[PDB]
Amino acid sequence: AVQSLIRAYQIRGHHVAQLDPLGILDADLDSSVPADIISSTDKLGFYGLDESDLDKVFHLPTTTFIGGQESALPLREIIRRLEMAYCQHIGVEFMFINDLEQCQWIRQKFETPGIMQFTNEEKRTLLARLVRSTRFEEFLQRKWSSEKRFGLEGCEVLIPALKTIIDKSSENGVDYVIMGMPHRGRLNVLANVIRKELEQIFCQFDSKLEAADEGSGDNITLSLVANPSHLEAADPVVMGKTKAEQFYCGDTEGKKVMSILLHGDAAFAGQGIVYETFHLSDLPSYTTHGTVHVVVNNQIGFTTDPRMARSSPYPTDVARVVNAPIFHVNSDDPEAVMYVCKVAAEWRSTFHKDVVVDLVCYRRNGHNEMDEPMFTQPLMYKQIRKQKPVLQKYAELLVSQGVVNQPEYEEEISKYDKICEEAFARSKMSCPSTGLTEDILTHIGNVASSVPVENFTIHGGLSRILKTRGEMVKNRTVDWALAEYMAFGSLLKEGIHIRLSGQDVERGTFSHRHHVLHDQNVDKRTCIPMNHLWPNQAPYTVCNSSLSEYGVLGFELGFAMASPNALVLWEAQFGDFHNTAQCIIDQFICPGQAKWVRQNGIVLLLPHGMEGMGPEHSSARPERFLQMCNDDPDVLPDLKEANFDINQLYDCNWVVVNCSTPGNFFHVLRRQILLPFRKPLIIFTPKSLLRHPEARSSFDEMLPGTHFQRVIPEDGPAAQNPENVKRLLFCTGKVYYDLTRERKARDMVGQVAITRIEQLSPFPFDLLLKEVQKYPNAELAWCQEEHKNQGYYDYVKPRLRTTISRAKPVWYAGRDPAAAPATGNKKTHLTELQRLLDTAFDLDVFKNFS
Amino acid sequence: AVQSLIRAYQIRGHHVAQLDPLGILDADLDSSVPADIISSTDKLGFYGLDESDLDKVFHLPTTTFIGGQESALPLREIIRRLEMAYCQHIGVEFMFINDLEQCQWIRQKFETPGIMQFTNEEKRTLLARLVRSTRFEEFLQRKWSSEKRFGLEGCEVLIPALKTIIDKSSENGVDYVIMGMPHRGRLNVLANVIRKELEQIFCQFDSKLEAADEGSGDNITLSLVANPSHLEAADPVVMGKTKAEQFYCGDTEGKKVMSILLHGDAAFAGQGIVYETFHLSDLPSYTTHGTVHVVVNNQIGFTTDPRMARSSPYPTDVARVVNAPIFHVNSDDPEAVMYVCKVAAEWRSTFHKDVVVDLVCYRRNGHNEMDEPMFTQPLMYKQIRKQKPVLQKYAELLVSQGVVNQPEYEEEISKYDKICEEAFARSKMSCPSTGLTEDILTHIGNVASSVPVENFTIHGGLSRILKTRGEMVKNRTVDWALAEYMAFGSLLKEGIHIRLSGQDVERGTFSHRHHVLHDQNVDKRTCIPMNHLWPNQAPYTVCNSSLSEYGVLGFELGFAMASPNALVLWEAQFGDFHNTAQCIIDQFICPGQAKWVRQNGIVLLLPHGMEGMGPEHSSARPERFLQMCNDDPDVLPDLKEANFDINQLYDCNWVVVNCSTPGNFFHVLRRQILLPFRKPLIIFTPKSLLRHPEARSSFDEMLPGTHFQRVIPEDGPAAQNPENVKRLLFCTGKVYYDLTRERKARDMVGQVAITRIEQLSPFPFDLLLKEVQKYPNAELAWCQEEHKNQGYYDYVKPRLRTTISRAKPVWYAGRDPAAAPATGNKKTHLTELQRLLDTAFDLDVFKNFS
Ligand SMILES: Cc1ncc(C[n+]2csc(CCOP(=O)(O)OP(=O)(O)O)c2C)c(N)n1
Ligand SMILES: Cc1ncc(C[n+]2csc(CCOP(=O)(O)OP(=O)(O)O)c2C)c(N)n1
Ligand SMILES: [Ca+2]
Ligand SMILES: [Ca+2]
Ligand SMILES: [Mg+2]
Ligand SMILES: [Mg+2]
C-alpha cells in the first residue's frame, strides 16, 4: 500500500520541487502537478487511501531509509519526510538506473534523517568562501564596469562547491584532477579554487583576456585545460587527457586521477557532442572510470527562453541514456549544494561511474556585463531586481543563529577589500637516422608472418595471406602491412608506447593488415602476434571505436597531450568523413601552439583516392588541409641555411604527407618520435596500392644510414640522358603508377620524367629547385586524379612558381572543375580518365597557342 | 500485491524477451536475467509470494488489459499472458512516458487478447510480398554476383512492414508521405513499395547506380528523397520538407502529411545528429506532428561488435529523452512485425508524436556482397549458415495450416520469375527591376518606425530607437533594420512567404532590428509591426531555434525545397560556428543540383568582421566557401554575350556576397525571389556597420529603375580627375570605411581610389575590367583586415590576374599569415591595424625593389 506511494515519490519528486530561486520561472517547463504527488488530502484516492489513513502507522519497506533507527511510522511522518527529502530544494532523478545496489546507495545518501547537518567550522569556512567570491565579483564590477567579463553573479555558490569536490577527492585518495569549464565564472575559479597570484590575474585581465590559457597548481595537483569558445567542444579532450594520465601513472582502476567538467544549461541539451561523449564513457577503450559533470541552470541562454530551446523537461536528459544519476539543487541554499557535492564525490569514488549535478540559479545581469535584458524578458528582471543576494541572506541567518558576529564579518570584508586593493596596486638539432639493422627486420618479419600460439588455428585465406607474407619476408621485400609492423615494432623496442584507434582498424577497412588474429573454434580466443616480438617492450593497443568521428578524434588528441614519448594514431574508414569533426581540426589541432603554447604529436591517417567507388567514397579534401597553413606563398626562404629541413619543420603548425611507397611510410612514423619537438601529422594513405603488384620496396631502403625522402626523384632511362627529356611531370600518390604503365604502353620512356612529392607541408623548396634545375628543357606540369577546384593544384601552383623565379608556367593535366568530389556515373569515369591520360604522354597540348 | 509484479514486467520485459533470431548473440548486450522477472517458481520470494499463490485468483488493476472479457484471472494465467505479451518476440519500452493516456493506449494494444489475429487474405498478401522480396533479392544475386551492392537478405520483412505502414496511413487520412532511408535495401523499396518500372531499375543498376537520386509515385503520393552515404545526415532535411508541405497544403495539425525515416542500429546510437533532430521534434516552430522511425537491428556495424560500439543497452536510447515509445520485434515472426507497424501508424495518427520501431534481424552476407565475414566473427556466421530463411519457414507453416497449396506457391514463384526475365530482356531571361514607388516605402517606414497596437507600451530605449527610426524615415534615409523591413514588406505584398529562423533573430545579436516587440507589464503580449502592413499579404514568421547549428540548417534546407515561392533565411550568431554544420554544406547545399536535379534558394546570413573580440568571434571563413566553386580561374568567359550576368549566374552552384550598404542588401533579397530560377545565397553581414553614422543610403537608390549593383565604383574627386589617381585599391566590407577615414587623415583624396566588390561568386569579370580600364596608371592592390592565408586573397588574386591579360601584378595590403583567425592580445591588434593602414596608404612599400 505504501510501497507504491514511496516509489511514486522516488519517480516524480523532482517535478514538484521548489528548485526555482526567483519563484516565477519554472525548472521543468510545466507548472502542472501530476496526480502521483499528494499535494492535498483529497488526492489520496489515487492510491485508494483517504484522510482516515493519515494517522495509521505503516511499516517501511527494505528500499526506504527515512526510518532513522525506527521501523514503522505514522503516515504523516512518511509524507512529511518524503516531501522534505525529494520535493524541497533537492530533486533526485535516479530510478531509471536498473542496478539495485547503486539505487540503494543513492537512497541511503539522500533519504536519511540527521545526515545533512554541518559544524560551526564548516559554516565559517563556507562564509569565508562566499565572501571571497562575492567581494571579488563586486571588485571586478566596480573597477571594470565597461567590459564583458561574463560574471557569475546570482550563482556564487559555485566556488565552494568546486572546493568541496576537490577536498572530498583528496581525502578519498585522488592526487590529480583535470578540470574543464566554460567562460562564465572563469576568473573566480582561477582566483579562488585554483589559487593564483591575484596580481597576475589583474594583469591578464587587461591584456591577453580573450585567450583562455592553462592554469596549473602544484598537495593535490590541479590543472585547468585551455578551452575554446565553442560550447561543449572540449569534453572528449579532457577525457583523453585523463585516460593518458591514468595509463602513465599505472592506475589501472584510476583511483588517483579525476575528471571534472562544467556545462551551461542551454548547451547541455542543444549539442549532439554531449551524446557522443557520453557514449564513450563505458566503452572499454574510452573508459576513465568516472567523471563529474556540473551543469549550471540559469534558466536562460542569451535572450532565448527555456521552452523554445529544448524538447525535454530538464536540460540534463542526455545523461539518462547511460543510467547516470542526476541531482538538481537550488543555489539559494548552500548547505544542500555542499551535501550534494559530497555525495557526488563519494559516488564517483565508489562506483567509478559518471554523475551529473544541476545547480539551479538565476542571472543577475545581461549576457554580457553591459547588455540590456529588459528588451526581451521584462518580468524576469522585474522579479530579479527585488531579491536579496545569497551572501546577504546567509550572513543574516548566521548572525541570527549566533555562529558569527557582525564585527567579525565586517572585518573579514574589510581585510579582503584591502587584499584586493594591495594586489591591484602591485599589479600596476639534426635529422636522425631511422634505419634498422637486418636482424631486427628479419625477426619482426618472421614473427609477423606466422602464429606464436601453439594450438591456434586460423582461416584458410588468412593462412594464404601469412604464407604470402613469409614468401615476401624470405625474398627481402616489404609491403604496406609489413612496413607498418616493422615501424611499430621498432618503436616498441625502444620503449615508446603505441596506440592505434578508429573505425575497423583491427582487421583493416580493406582487410590488408590483420593486426588481430581470431580463433575459429574457441569463442573469445584472440592473438596479437606483435606483443610477442621482444621480452621487454612498451605495450601495444589496438581499439575499435564507435561511429562518432568527432568524440574519438578529441579523445585521441587529449590522450596525445599527456606525454611526448607516445605514438597515437587515428584512422578513418574513408577520407570524406573527417568533416564531421571539423571543429576539432578548426580549434584544437590547427592553433594548439600559436595560442596556448603546448605541444602535440597526434598522427592522422586518411585514405584518399579516386577509383570510381562514388562521389563521396572518393577523395580526402586535401585542399582544405593545405590552406590552413601559416606559410606565405610569395616568399622564398633561405635555402642555404645550416640544415633548413629541421628548421623549416620547427616553424609550422602541422605536417601533411601523401605516401605511396611502404618505405617512406615506415620512415615517417619513426621520424615522428625520434625528433626532439612534436607536431601533428596528417597522412593520406592509398586505397588500391595495398594489393598492387609493384607497390613494394626492398630491405635496402630500411637499413642503417637511410633517411626519409621528402621528394623521390625519377629513376630510369630519363635520368641517364636528362637533356633529351621533355614534359617534366609532377604527381602525388597512386597517379604515378597509372602514368608509368602508359609510358610503357605509348613508348614514352626517355621522353617523360615523372616525380613524386611525399611531403607537401612544409613545402620542400630546396629539393624541388635542385631537381627542376636537373632538366633545363622540360615543360613543368601537374597531374591530378581530382578536379581542378580540388586536390593540390591551387596550393602547389603558387609554391612551384615561387620556387623558380616565375620563369616558367605551371600547366595542369587533370579533371575539369566540378561541384562534387567525383561523378556518380560509371561510364563517364573511364572517359574522364582517358582524357586525363590523353594530355600526359601527348605533347603540344599547351604549345598549340603559338 | 500483483500491481507491483505487473509494473515490474512492464518495466523489464524487453530485457528477457526472445528477440534474438540467433539463439547466440544478444540485443541488450547482457545475458543475465534481472530478479524482477519470474523465470522460475523459486523467484517469487522477491515479491513475497510463493508456489502456493500460483493458483489463487487475483483481481486485475485498472492499468492492465490482459483478460479480454475477464476481471480476475488465476495467477498462472496472468504470468503466462504477461510472458506472452512482453517476453515473446516483442519488447515494449514505453513506461518512461509520464503521460497516462498514452500509457493506457499502448498497454491496451500489446497487453489485450485476440487482437493480433489475421485473416487468410492478409496471409496471402503477406506471402505474395515476401515472395516478391526474396525472389527479387535472389535474382539480383544470381544476375549480379561480383558487385558491392548492399543487400537486404536476413531482413526480408521490411517491405511488407513499409507497405502496411503506408496502407494504414492512407486509411487514416494521410494523402502525402515523405520517406528517407539508407542504402541497405534501397532497390527493394524502389521496386516493391514505391513501385517503379523494373526495366528502368535494371537499367539504372548498371549505370548511375552510385548516386541516390529521387524516386516518386503518384492514390497516395510517395516521395523518396535523395540522401548521401553519410549516416543520419538527412533526417532534418526530411522533417523540413514535411513541415513545408504541411504549411502550403493548409494542414495546421498535419493530418494529411506523414514522415517516415529508416536507420541502422549502429548509426542510431553513434551519431550526435539524432540527438539534435529529436530535440527539434517538439519545439513549436519545428514541429512536424509525428515521424515513424524504423531501426533495423542486424546486431553488427561493418565488422564491429555491438559491445564495442555503444554504452547504452539498446541502440535506440536517444528516443527516451523525448518520451517516444519504442517497440522491438523479432523479424522471424512476420505477423508481429505487421501488428507493430499497424500500432505505430495508429499511434502517430492519434497522438501526433514520434514513435520508433526496432526490427531485430541478422545479416546473411558480409558488408558488401563479396566481403569475407569469417575473418572477424567466426561463430556468428557459423551459426548463420545453419538457419532457414524466413520465407521458407513461413511457406512451410502456411502449407501445414492449409492457407496455401504447394502448386499455387510454386506457380507464384514461377510467374514472378518470368516477370523478372521479361523485364531484364526489355531493359537490354533578363535582370528584373527591383525598385519600388515612394508610397510603399513611406508606408513601410511609418509602420516600422511606430507601434501599431494602441494600449501597447514599450521600454524607454526602444522608444528612443523608434524615434530615431521615424527621424530617419522623415528625412529619406534608410539603415540596416529599415532596409530589412522594407525588403520583407515589399516581398510580403506580392504574396511571397518569408521565414527567418536561427539564433537570437527576434531581437538581433547586436540588438539592432527589434522585429518583435514585447510588452513591459502585460504577460506574453507580443506585437509584430510588419504583420500589419497591407490588408491582403503573405504570412510572416520569425523563430528562435536551439543551439544546434546542424539540425536547424538542415531543417531550413529541407523547407526551401518544397516550393519556389518562398524566402527562407538562416541566421548565425557569428560566422565562426557554421563549421559545426559543415556536413550539411558539404553533401547537401554544394552539389544539390549537380548530383540530384532539385533546385534550392535558401539564404544564409553570416556575421563577419575583425574587431578584436577574439580569435573565435572574428571572421566567417570566406576562403572555405570561395574554394567550393565550379569555376575555372584560368579561363576568361565571353564578356560580349547578350547578358553575361543572368547567364553567368545560371551556371553557378551558389552565390556569395558581402554587403556593406543597406540598399544592396535590399536589392539582393528582392532579386533572389524575382529571378526565374533558384540558387543558394550566402551573405556576409557586417557587425560594426549597424550603428555606423555614415552606413546609410537615400531613398533614391530604392526607387523604380534601380538594379542591384554587383560592383560599386569609386565616387569622389578621384573619379573627376582619373588620370592623376595612384594606388587603385580594392576592398570588400567595412575596411572601405576605415580606409576613407585614414585617407581623410592623410589628405590623399584624389591620389587613392577605393572600390568595393559586393559579389565575389559569380565573379564580375566585366564591370571589374571596365573600372580597371578606367584608371590607366594605377597600381592594383587588395586590402583585407584578415591574414594573407585566409580571407579573399587566394580567391580574388587568380581571378583579378585572369580579368586582365596578366599584364599587372596584384599586390597585397593586409595582415601577415597566422595559424589562427585572429589574435588574443588586445595590444597587438592596434599595432597590426596601424601597420595595415600604413602599408595600404604609403606609395613605395612595393616600388622600393627597383
Ligand atoms: C556553438 C556555439 N557556441 C556559442 C555560441 C554563442 N554563445 C556564446 S555563450 C551562448 C549562450 C549559451 O547558453 P547557456 O549555456 O545557457 O549559457 P549562460 O547563460 O551560462 O552564459 C551562446 C549562444 C554560438 N552561436 N554557437
Ligand atoms: C559517418 C560515417 N558514415 C559512414 C561510414 C562508413 N559506413 C558505411 S555503411 C557503415 C556501417 C553502418 O552500420 P549499421 O548501421 O549497423 O548498418 P549496416 O551494416 O547494417 O548497413 C559504415 C561504417 C563512416 N565510417 N562514417
Ligand atoms: Ca512541475
Ligand atoms: Ca537480458
Ligand atoms: Mg545559461
Ligand atoms: Mg547494421
Swiss-Prot record, chains A, B:
Q: What does the further note read?
A: The mitochondrial 2-oxoglutarate and 2-oxoadipate dehydrogenase complexes (OGDHC and OADHC, respectively) share their E2 (DLST) and E3 (dihydrolipoyl dehydrogenase or DLD) components, but the E1 component is specific to each complex (E1o and E1a (DHTK1), respectively).
> What are the entry keywords?
Acetylation, Calcium, Glycolysis, Isopeptide bond, Magnesium, Metal-binding, Mitochondrion, Nucleus, Oxidoreductase, Phosphoprotein, Thiamine pyrophosphate, Transit peptide, Ubl conjugation
Upper taxonomic lineage: Eukaryota, Metazoa, Chordata, Craniata, Vertebrata
Family listed: Belongs to the alpha-ketoglutarate dehydrogenase family.
**Positions carrying N6-succinyllysine:** K418
This protein's source sits in the domain of life called Eukaryota
Summarize where Mg(2+) binds, as residue positions. Answer: D265, N298, I300
The residues that the entry says bind Ca(2+) are H15, D28, D30
Question: What CDD domains has UniProt attached to this entry?
Answer: TPP_E1_OGDC_like
Q: List the disulfide bonds.
A: none
Instruction: Quote the subcellular location field of this record.
Output: Mitochondrion; Nucleus
Q: What is this protein called?
A: 2-oxoglutarate dehydrogenase complex component E1
How does this polypeptide assemble, per the annotation?
Homodimer. The 2-oxoglutarate dehydrogenase complex is composed of OGDH (2-oxoglutarate dehydrogenase; E1), DLST (dihydrolipoamide succinyltransferase; E2), DLD (dihydrolipoamide dehydrogenase; E3), and the assembly factor KGD4. It contains multiple copies of the three enzymatic components (E1, E2 and E3). In the nucleus, the 2-oxoglutarate dehydrogenase complex associates with KAT2A. Interacts with ABHD11; this interaction maintains the functional lipoylation of the 2-oxoglutarate dehydrogenase complex.
Q: Summarize the protein's role.
A: 2-oxoglutarate dehydrogenase (E1o) component of the 2-oxoglutarate dehydrogenase complex (OGDHC). Participates in the first step, rate limiting for the overall conversion of 2-oxoglutarate to succinyl-CoA and CO(2) catalyzed by the whole OGDHC. Catalyzes the irreversible decarboxylation of 2-oxoglutarate (alpha-ketoglutarate) via the thiamine diphosphate (ThDP) cofactor and subsequent transfer of the decarboxylated acyl intermediate on an oxidized dihydrolipoyl group that is covalently amidated to the E2 enzyme (dihydrolipoyllysine-residue succinyltransferase or DLST).
